[PDB]
Symmetry: D2
Subunit: 220 residues, 4 copies
């Protein structure tokens, strides 16, 4: 069902700081290698008045390299697919939510996305477009109430060299009965490969890899 190469099509409807916008994307990736590339176009609301980086992790954990010894919640859930829900709590009290309904037809994933951003300070690094990238990260994956949660401490690198923190809490909900994983980690590195001046066109890459801890247990 999940092919070695899969295409992607998406549509995000968003509001941030009261500015409405729509973004469409198309791309492709390699689910079993945990890599993917998307081409994103702002089709309504351009140019965006806020840092593009707040959006980029909203643009599918099917694209994760899972070792054989950890259950792959994400690839098991197709063709039926899954949705996810996320809260993003920034350290200056900007709060974003997003939801994404993920389906499959043929060799293509489709995502139907909403994004809301609230309460960003006008002089803060989001509304002043002071961000450079997300740092790579490690997301903690755990089962709760029969679905999978993933929490990650994310940080934007800023112009100037400091960081701006955001706490992600995501719940990933399979539309079929899959084998559930044990507690584990997904290491990520998301990167904008290219963009025009106002980020109306963006080329976006993510590498993600699941694992257990590298440290052995002593209490055994």
């Amino acid at each position: 069902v999940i092919k070695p190469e899969m295409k992607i099509k998406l549509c995000m409807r968003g509001t941030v700081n009261g500015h409405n916008f729509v973004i469409e994307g198309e791309g492709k990736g390699n689910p079993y290698e945990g890599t993917q590339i998307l081409d994103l176009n702002v089709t309504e609301g351009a140019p965006l008045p806020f840092a593009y980086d707040i959006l980029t992790t909203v643009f599918n954990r099917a694209f994760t390299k899972y070792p054989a010894d950890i259950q792959d919640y994400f690839k098991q859930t197709f063709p039926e697919g899954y949705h996810w829900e996320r809260s993003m709590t920034y350290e200056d009290q900007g709060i974003c939510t997003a939801t994404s309904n993920i389906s499959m037809r043929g060799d293509c994933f489709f995502y139907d996305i909403t994004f809301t951003g609230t309460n960003f300070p006008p002089n803060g690094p989001v509304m002043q477009k002071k961000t450079l990238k997300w740092e790579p990260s490690t997301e903690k994956m755990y089962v709760r109430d029969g679905v999978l949660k993933g929490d990650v401490n994310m940080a934007l690198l800023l112009e100037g060299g400091g960081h701006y923190r955001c706490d992600f809490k995501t719940t990933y909900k399979a539309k079929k009965d899959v084998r559930l994983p044990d507690y584990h980690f997904v290491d990520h590195r998301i990167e904008i490969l290219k963009h025009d001046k106002d980020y109306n066109k963006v080329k976006l890459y993510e590498n993600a890899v699941a694992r257990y801890s590298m440290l052995p247990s002593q209490a055994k």
Copy 2:
């Protein structure tokens, strides 16, 4: 331009726990008295699988009784209007956001609303519809960076007794330059006065009054 009686029309497009919905409403109230009634209809996604109460405060601070010694940020901004943004952090990590763009044509307010709910536990009081009402509340109003913030500790009274807590942080953003208020309070009491079985049809009322502290300064 804000009349003694104003009408209201609204539209909400919402998603909670992945469930999309659309609610339309109409009503009216008395802005200088701080009271209003709305009639709300679920037009898509009926029946809602969650507690209707999580939406009700999202269905306009123009409907507030302001004494003359507190600047009224809300009434000053019309006819151009204002927009607001809110986060609602529940104690069990459900997080909702909402935005509303509020305009006026004649004797009628219009609201264009989004609502997103994330990460509600499936056996919690929201997804199990165990809520009875919001308690009345006291919102704290303070100026920040030229606009008006209001924060309020909210609580849902639950079936069975006990409360479920939610922290609201709102930013209200005037579309023209207004006189800003000093720190103050808005007391509220919101109530669903009638509903049908599945809350497809709701009649909703709010009373809100602004004030300084009732305690004198030493």
Copy 3:
């Protein structure tokens, strides 16, 4: 009843904020059924304090609360044995403070044994640069949870220049014995520093608190 219309207060606080250890002693008195009280506070170790004194003030007793008769008073009925309370204070710039208080009584005197810890205040923030003027008056939401009484309050420091710096308080109040619990209600506050010396080595502090239900009628 052992809560007399006039009661005295004695307290000791051991604290640490931003790594700086300190000890504060206080003595005072108030009128419990009226909701008013006065304290004289002296820093006995770690002076001068490197942070805004206002972070400490609400930790220096809900026994000093005016309770209308239709609202159950959780607090006075806990005595003579008393009660303890535990509090988290989460500031908007990620400073987080905890405090605990054990409140006992002998004769016409309350005694408080207090701890305070402050973590992660930004070095240029209004706490460590002492930019605060006062707390604003407040409304605390009181609700039963798990057989004890919780109170949550959105607090705000007025700062030099008229902006505010927000703090969310979450307190649990726990009677040493079983007592009748209240319905949901509110406690309004106004806390004020009446006098201080330049480094806040000596502070005179006042509070007024009054419980109520909502003044708005119900439909």
Copy 4:
């Protein structure tokens, strides 16, 4: 260098959780460059503890971290003068703990002066009911802010029954002298109770901690 291949540890903690005062002494030793250590802890007042001991364990020194040559070691650099740390621990059911530790050195021994406060734990929650099995292994995000080092980590307690109970840690580590500051990096941990007596009056405690950059390469 004053940091020897093997260092001893002595510590005193004064704490309060849920109204319950206690004092815990400890002694042990570790290998700072290997990132490993063992402590033996003894409750000297307030025994037996009425709460899950796990809440205390990460408060019982990042000098014990294996740092690679390409990441600056904030912690080793700050001795003999030492450092202090400040920590908030926010649990998902509104329990909030703080801790502070002052870390000094004489000869081949570290000394820690520790406070711990725990507030607002629910009485039927897993803390007060002693339902915790262990912390999961974790990945702490390390970043400089205002000339000192912060570390944030998403922690989880494994519970009886197999679910997890989340806690968000925010730490600030503050050197007592000038040191070379590191770039953004990670510290992987695995903390374990190796042995304990019936009421946890005596506990033998191990940590392994290792600093790293991300394992994933950049496409930028």
